[model samples]
Target: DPSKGRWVEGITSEGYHYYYDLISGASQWEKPEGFQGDLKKTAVKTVWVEGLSEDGFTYYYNTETGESRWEKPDD
Candidate 1:
């Protein structure tokens, strides 16, 4: 869990989206290299989102429900 990374937006008007490294406890102004684009996870709903393909596409998976699809869910 600590090895994962997430994107955090700035609060101020001049602030920009930055990358946060959970393992290192560090942040950077520029997007991190080899970042997993569009991947996210939620604790409340336990929705696991993973998207990254060789042909360039996205998919959605629900860990709680055990469902998956190439297209995004309606929610």
Candidate 2:
């Protein structure tokens, strides 16, 4: 089945704009895991990539080459 994906942008409690993915009845936070610091402090505006396959599996891009694989979240 084809999954419908959408991008959601919002501000965190720390006043940083966060972009998340709305896919497969789940909300996957776009920010890198374990990143508690302020995004403005780090000068990182966006921290996500598109055009990658997420076919009924959780995964992330390790590089800009579009290489991807299944990624299990720590929860």
Candidate 3:
């Protein structure tokens, strides 16, 4: 979970899975509710490349679909 948060995984004496949050130094027996949300938000497939055009305008280009936009797209 280094990419999203400082969460670390662990196991109990009975082999039950647990999680640890390094940011808060909190440990929980049950899985975090919002833990899976982090991974879900990273499922975007498009990669947008941004640059300033010759016309003094900033644009975003998606290499996968060859689409260009005047404004930056939401990540």
Candidate 4:
């Protein structure tokens, strides 16, 4: 994203951001209701949060993976 020599970033609501790439021609990361919606939305897959993952399991997210699964804590 930083190789286009023209990257852009902006905030929308609640500090949330809505990026727009002129070169890549991407916006809203392809919302879950537009072209390539589901696929694009779940492509990069980012959690950005971590804590407990129901079923008594613990989980943490940091926009590092596409599939965020829960993990059991120390026994």
In terms of lDDT, the best-performing candidate is: 3
- Collision pairs in model 2: none
Q: After superposition on all CA atoms, what RMSD does each candidate show versus the true structure?
A: 10.0, 14.6, 15.8, 10.7
Please provide TM-scores, in order, for all candidate models, with all chains considered together: 0.34, 0.26, 0.37, 0.28
> Model 2, 75: alpha-carbon shift in Å?
46
* lDDT scores of the candidates, listed in order: 0.57, 0.48, 0.64, 0.46
State model 2's lDDT: 0.48
- Candidate 1 on 1-75: residue-level lDDT in tens? 445555554433433335666666776776665454544454233366664554455667877878877875565
Q: Is candidate 1 or candidate 3 better by lDDT?
A: 3
What TM-score does structure 4 among the candidates reach?
A: 0.28
Off by over 4 Å in 1: 1-48
RMSD, model 2, all Cα superposed?
Answer: 14.6
In order of lDDT, best first, we have 3, 1, 2, 4
For model 3, what is the C-alpha lDDT against the true structure?
Answer: 0.64
CA deviation > 4 Å runs, candidate 2: 1-5, 31-75
lDDT of 4 at 48: 48
Task: Report the Cα lDDT for candidate 4.
Answer: 0.46
Model 4: clashing residue pairs?
Answer: 49-61, 50-60
- What lDDT score goes with residue 38 in model 2? 43
Per-residue lDDT of candidate 3, residues 1-75 (tens digit): 454456676755634557888777888766655553343255743467555555356778887778889886664
